[PDB]
Design a protein around this motif. Sequence first.
Motif, PDB file in Angstrom:
ATOM      1  N   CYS A  12       0.833  -1.191   0.000  1.00 39.61           N
ATOM      2  CA  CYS A  12       0.000   0.000   0.000  1.00 39.61           C
ATOM      3  C   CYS A  12       0.867   1.240   0.000  1.00 39.61           C
ATOM      4  O   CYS A  12       1.835   1.335   0.771  1.00 39.61           O
ATOM      5  N   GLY A  60      -6.930  -3.208  -2.768  1.00 34.05           N
ATOM      6  CA  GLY A  60      -7.922  -3.791  -1.885  1.00 34.05           C
ATOM      7  C   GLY A  60      -7.314  -4.780  -0.906  1.00 34.05           C
ATOM      8  O   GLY A  60      -6.195  -4.595  -0.427  1.00 34.05           O
ATOM      9  N   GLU A  62      -5.659  -8.039   0.929  1.00 34.57           N
ATOM     10  CA  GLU A  62      -4.703  -9.128   0.759  1.00 34.57           C
ATOM     11  C   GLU A  62      -5.439 -10.454   0.924  1.00 34.57           C
ATOM     12  O   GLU A  62      -5.799 -10.836   2.036  1.00 34.57           O
ATOM     13  N   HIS A  95       8.552 -11.111  -0.258  1.00 32.82           N
ATOM     14  CA  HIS A  95       7.225 -11.711  -0.172  1.00 32.82           C
ATOM     15  C   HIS A  95       6.471 -11.716  -1.506  1.00 32.82           C
ATOM     16  O   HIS A  95       5.897 -12.738  -1.902  1.00 32.82           O
TER      17      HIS A  95
HETATM   18  C1  DWI Z   1      -3.278  -0.390   0.160  1.00 28.27           C
HETATM   19  C2  DWI Z   1      -4.092  -1.411  -0.610  1.00 28.27           C
HETATM   20  O1  DWI Z   1      -4.929  -2.189   0.231  1.00 28.27           O
HETATM   21  C3  DWI Z   1      -3.191  -2.262  -1.522  1.00 28.27           C
HETATM   22  O2  DWI Z   1      -2.770  -1.768  -2.558  1.00 28.27           O
HETATM   23  N1  DWI Z   1      -2.806  -3.646  -1.235  1.00 28.27           N
HETATM   24  C4  DWI Z   1      -1.980  -4.350  -2.184  1.00 28.27           C
HETATM   25  C5  DWI Z   1      -2.278  -5.853  -2.120  1.00 28.27           C
HETATM   26  N2  DWI Z   1      -2.191  -6.389  -0.792  1.00 28.27           N
HETATM   27  C6  DWI Z   1      -1.266  -7.479  -0.635  1.00 28.27           C
HETATM   28  N3  DWI Z   1      -0.326  -7.447   0.305  1.00 28.27           N
HETATM   29  C7  DWI Z   1       0.534  -8.416   0.448  1.00 28.27           C
HETATM   30  O3  DWI Z   1       1.503  -8.328   1.472  1.00 28.27           O
HETATM   31  C8  DWI Z   1       1.160  -7.484   2.525  1.00 28.27           C
HETATM   32  C9  DWI Z   1       1.996  -7.956   3.772  1.00 28.27           C
HETATM   33  C10 DWI Z   1       1.843  -6.922   4.877  1.00 28.27           C
HETATM   34  C11 DWI Z   1       0.894  -7.595   5.856  1.00 28.27           C
HETATM   35  C12 DWI Z   1       1.067  -9.107   5.597  1.00 28.27           C
HETATM   36  N4  DWI Z   1       1.488  -9.196   4.213  1.00 28.27           N
HETATM   37  C13 DWI Z   1       2.470 -10.219   4.059  1.00 28.27           C
HETATM   38  C14 DWI Z   1       3.754  -9.459   4.027  1.00 28.27           C
HETATM   39  F1  DWI Z   1       4.185  -9.286   5.301  1.00 28.27           F
HETATM   40  C15 DWI Z   1       3.466  -8.134   3.392  1.00 28.27           C
HETATM   41  N5  DWI Z   1       0.639  -9.523  -0.240  1.00 28.27           N
HETATM   42  C16 DWI Z   1      -0.163  -9.892  -1.246  1.00 28.27           C
HETATM   43  C17 DWI Z   1      -0.465 -10.903  -2.219  1.00 28.27           C
HETATM   44  F2  DWI Z   1       0.466 -11.872  -2.069  1.00 28.27           F
HETATM   45  C18 DWI Z   1      -1.367 -10.907  -3.050  1.00 28.27           C
HETATM   46  C19 DWI Z   1      -1.474 -12.150  -3.972  1.00 28.27           C
HETATM   47  C20 DWI Z   1      -2.308 -13.181  -3.486  1.00 28.27           C
HETATM   48  C21 DWI Z   1      -2.297 -14.466  -4.036  1.00 28.27           C
HETATM   49  C22 DWI Z   1      -1.288 -14.771  -4.911  1.00 28.27           C
HETATM   50  C23 DWI Z   1      -0.489 -13.751  -5.438  1.00 28.27           C
HETATM   51  C24 DWI Z   1       0.378 -14.168  -6.421  1.00 28.27           C
HETATM   52  C25 DWI Z   1       1.200 -13.218  -6.991  1.00 28.27           C
HETATM   53  C26 DWI Z   1       1.142 -11.886  -6.571  1.00 28.27           C
HETATM   54  F3  DWI Z   1       1.952 -10.977  -7.126  1.00 28.27           F
HETATM   55  C27 DWI Z   1       0.284 -11.472  -5.573  1.00 28.27           C
HETATM   56  C28 DWI Z   1       0.269  -9.979  -5.193  1.00 28.27           C
HETATM   57  C29 DWI Z   1       0.272  -8.787  -4.886  1.00 28.27           C
HETATM   58  C30 DWI Z   1      -0.567 -12.425  -4.981  1.00 28.27           C
HETATM   59  N6  DWI Z   1      -2.116 -10.134  -3.201  1.00 28.27           N
HETATM   60  C31 DWI Z   1      -2.191  -9.098  -2.589  1.00 28.27           C
HETATM   61  C32 DWI Z   1      -1.274  -8.652  -1.454  1.00 28.27           C
HETATM   62  C33 DWI Z   1      -2.188  -5.448   0.287  1.00 28.27           C
HETATM   63  C34 DWI Z   1      -3.186  -4.352  -0.029  1.00 28.27           C
END
Ligand code: DWI
Length: 169
Positions: A12, A60, A62, A95
């Motif tokens: 974010c 949106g 995660e 990650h």
């Molecule tokens: C601000 C707004 O809500 C926003 O833009 N986002 C971006 C998407 N979303 C998100 N975050 C994370 O990691 C966040 C983190 C902080 C808290 C816990 N979490 C784990 C780490 F510590 C960092 N990760 C993902 C995410 F993996 C995915 C997603 C889901 C399923 C598969 C895949 C495969 C490939 C991908 F590139 C992604 C991506 C991106 C995947 N989706 C969204 C995430 C936070 C809110």
Amino acid sequence: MTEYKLVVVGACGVGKSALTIQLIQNHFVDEYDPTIEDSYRKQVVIDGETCLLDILDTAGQEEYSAMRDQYMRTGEGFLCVFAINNTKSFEDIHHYREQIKRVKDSEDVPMVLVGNKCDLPSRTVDTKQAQDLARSYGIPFIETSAKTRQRVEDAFYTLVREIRQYRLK
Ligand SMILES: *C[C@H](O)C(=O)N1CCN(c2nc(OC[C@@]34CCCN3C[C@H](F)C4)nc3c(F)c(-c4cccc5ccc(F)c(C#C)c45)ncc23)CC1
Ligand SMILES: Nc1nc2c(ncn2[C@@H]2O[C@H](COP(=O)(O)OP(=O)(O)O)[C@@H](O)[C@H]2O)c(=O)[nH]1
Ligand SMILES: [Mg+2]
């Protein structure tokens, strides 16, 4: 035309939406709603080829699910964005790459590492640090500013070039 499915990922606030809207609409959006996730298309010519870019601006919640994986899996290259004034967003890059490798089930996925907000004076992530990480990953690194548009086209077009290379192998 030839379609390229790009997925813009990262923490974010790093500038995912601002970068995407800059590329598509050539203007800088501040405070874009962080809950809105959309795909944007643009027809462009890159190295002589007419490309239809299809860019997913992830946002949106995660979410992890078989459906979400399936959707992400359709991405052909990933723009992995951090902000150069936010170290946490940089250390999150591992990650994101981990999840990309997981759903694509490959250690070879077209990816570009992007250090955004390079217009700002208060850098916390050194250019060299990010360059070295990118080199360990085997991917390009580019610093961008969605605000000034510096290297924004370069970042997205570099990812297209990476996808083109993967397709030819
Ligand atoms: C601000 C707004 O809500 C926003 O833009 N986002 C971006 C998407 N979303 C998100 N975050 C994370 O990691 C966040 C983190 C902080 C808290 C816990 N979490 C784990 C780490 F510590 C960092 N990760 C993902 C995410 F993996 C995915 C997603 C889901 C399923 C598969 C895949 C495969 C490939 C991908 F590139 C992604 C991506 C991106 C995947 N989706 C969204 C995430 C936070 C809110
Ligand atoms: N100075 C500067 N601010 C930026 C840049 N890119 C995004 N921002 C600002 O950072 C905030 C978050 O950007 P946003 O695109 O919403 O990030 P996202 O959550 O990753 O989609 C917004 O207020 C933007 O105006 C940039 O290159 N330079
Ligand atoms: Mg956003």
